[PDB]
Design a protein around this ligand. Structure first.
Ligand SMILES: *[C@H]1C=C(C(=O)[O-])C[C@@H](O)[C@@H]1O
Ligand SMILES: *[C@H]1C=C(C(=O)[O-])C[C@@H](O)[C@@H]1O
Lengths: 253, 253
């Protein structure tokens, strides 16, 4: 009754939640060094957090890294994400360029998924999505709130809008100010998963307090969880290796 | 700040939730066989589910087991529990023997904690609680519902009755019939913890669906969690060695 998102040998939205490991190097040497350490590691998808790449405004240099990166990762699903400043990024860039970066990178045929930020707008979203599906690229439409956890109804409403915008995978990250906020996130996730969701969704409650939301996706509905290699790409992620053992332990419980 | 329950080298209600493992053997040899396996294991407390013991109706023989058991787990905290048929037990006994068993054993000075069922009535509870504290034995006043998860308010109400009846550790285990019921348990748990708790509490949502409640007590408020050795004594138990790593992992988070 729900659609699944297949990327290579990985089926998002079925079985145990899929582990995604970010690459956050500031330069080609470190990025390649990062990719080499993950080739034979136990994980499902790799996310290139390009917002960390120092020459990110130079599209040719971004492609150069992308080529070399695919050579080492060959058939591991690869998500491309430029996380903007409003949603936790550190590099500021034009909105016209955010579109160009995502389109040009989508056009290479080298990325399997691309992340597009909801707030960025219908104009930006529709163009990135239409062009990503041209090349069979799956799209994550994402939304992050680093200060608050909206009410469950509001969270559900955002995941629904993302779905209307053609997102192959709606994604929402929220920040708890208390323990109950964490449960509100889980509550909205399962209501979405059971009643309104039409495909897989990705959700998380950030920081140490909401870490449970990164582990219990199999019961509650989040199809993908992010684990860190050396350093964190978002507050609350634990090492991908420990995430793998916890997900496996819960798969047989 | 509030009360903590000290049993030997273990401080319940501080840092990591504590791990309790039950011994469920039917005869002396098996019980001791289990004790030797948990002797130097990474657990905090050992629970003797004496209801599994075939010769439970002869106090003499029950005591003969304690004496030998101690020789192995002399320094490890020992909880003595006779789980009645009504709340998941496997052996029927008169309410009067239930009292004498708990009083006689508690009188030996060999047990560190004992579990009395809330629904067993104030008569039985006052009698057992009073005597227990006189021997300096901690009391867990418990309640289990294998059918459903009562509304949040009821769970907190039960946990509160337990405190007023003098429990050193209130305990409730409930059965989820849906994912939301798991969040209700956690929500009720956190409410007790921040608003009404004067002592550490123990809570869990049973079955695979509720397993997440055995892993996140540090955040939501449960001070003790039960893990299985070779097999489970309640639906949804994880092996104790695995449980230990997840709790240590989440403690530093
Ligand atoms: C989306 C969400 C993340 C998280 O909360 O862990 C990590 C980021 O790197 C992703 O873009
Ligand atoms: C009380 C709770 C249990 C649980 O749900 O794990 C098992 C019993 O052994 C305890 O007495």
């Amino acid at each position: 009754m729900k659609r699944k998102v297949q990327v290579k040998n990985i089926t998002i939205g079925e079985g145990r939640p899929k582990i995604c490991v970010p690459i956050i190097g500031k330069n080609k040497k470190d990025i390649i060094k990062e990719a080499k350490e993950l080739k034979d590691a136990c994980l499902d998808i790799i996310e290139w957090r390009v917002d960390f790449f120092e020459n990110v405004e130079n599209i040719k240099e971004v492609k150069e890294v992308l080529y070399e990166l695919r050579s080492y990762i060959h058939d591991i699903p690869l998500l491309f994400t430029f996380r903007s400043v409003v949603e936790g990024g550190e590099k500021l860039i034009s909105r016209d360029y955010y579109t160009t970066l995502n389109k040009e990178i989508s056009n290479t045929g080298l990325v399997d998924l691309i992340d597009v930020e909801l707030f960025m707008g219908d104009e930006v979203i529709d163009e990135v999505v239409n062009f990503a599906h041209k090349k069979e690229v799956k799209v994550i439409i994402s939304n992050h709130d680093f200060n608050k956890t909206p009410k469950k109804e509001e969270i559900v409403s955002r995941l629904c809008r993302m779905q209307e915008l053609g997102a192959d995978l709606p994604k929402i990250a929220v920040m708890p100010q208390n323990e109950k906020d964490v449960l509100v996130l889980l509550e909205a996730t399962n209501e979405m998963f059971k009643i309104y969701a039409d495909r897989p969704i990705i959700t998380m409650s950030m920081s140490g307090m909401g870490v449970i939301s990164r582990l219990c996706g199999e019961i509650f509905g989040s199809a993908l969880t992010f684990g860190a290699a050396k350093s964190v790409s978002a507050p609350g992620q634990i090492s991908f290796k420990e995430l793998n053992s916890v997900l496996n332990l819960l798969h047989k419980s």
